[PDB]
Amino acid sequence: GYALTEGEDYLVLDKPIPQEQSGKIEVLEFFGYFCVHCHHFDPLLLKLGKALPSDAYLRTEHVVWQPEMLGLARMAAAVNLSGLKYQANPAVFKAVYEQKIRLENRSVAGKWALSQKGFDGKKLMRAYDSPEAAAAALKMQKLTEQYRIDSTPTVIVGGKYRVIFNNGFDGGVHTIKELVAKVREERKRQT
């Protein structure tokens, strides 16, 4: 099978990241659109996300390490606020990592978004402009600094378990699935 041994598969965080929901097991991913490993790992992570039972969920946050790149953090806010994660991610990652398009810039984003064709780019920009998006951008920066996120992708399952990708990011999916099972059993009540 696939036993979960500490200091091997995962590390118990020093200082847990509060889930945005009590009652369900959070799978948290920090990432950047400029990160070749996030880009590659993203299809696999969304797939896991879509298959997660109803008691668990995926949450993704975009690291902010330099003020100039808060706009990428804001584009991620758009993507998610808009409900377009499953549609837009591949395209967004592509534009940023493969095409070096500067989506942190607003004129550029809006243009790219509306030039798109595989999802409602209009919707995306409605959300990108929403004041809720800027607020989420700042919370993302806050999250980065507050919890010392110095590498992407960082996956914390259930607030208190940090994934160690000792056999590749591809190998971490079936570790994340086990961490949710671990938190579930930790949550579960008796008689």
| Structure tokens given for 96 | 């940023």
Query: How far, in Å, CA of 162 to CA of 138, rounded?
Result: 23
Measured between its terminal Cα atoms, the distance across the chain in Å is: 29
Query: How far, in Å, CA of 146 to CA of 140, rounded?
Result: 10
3-class DSSP assignment, residue 75: helix
3-class DSSP assignment, residue 103: coil
Q: What angle do CA 96, 147, 100 make, to 5 degrees?
A: 10
CA-closest candidate to residue 156, choices 67, 1, 21, 30: 30
Query: How far, in Å, CA of 92 to CA of 76, rounded?
Result: 9
Experimental method: X-ray
CA-closest candidate to residue 140, choices 70, 88, 91, 86: 70
Strands 161-163 and 154-157 turn out to be antiparallel
Please name the residue that has the structure tokens 């659109």: 33
User: Which domains, ranges and CATH numbers included, belong to the chain?
Assistant: 1-191 (3.40.30.10)
| Structure tokens given for 18 | 């509060």
Q: Is residue 75 a contact partner of residue 111, using CB atoms and an 8 Å limit?
A: no
How far, in Å, are 6, 11, 113, 131, 135 from residue 155 at the CA level?
15, 11, 28, 27, 23
Per-residue exposure over 121-136, b if at least 16 CB sit within 10 Å of its own CB, e if not = bebbbebbeeeebbeb
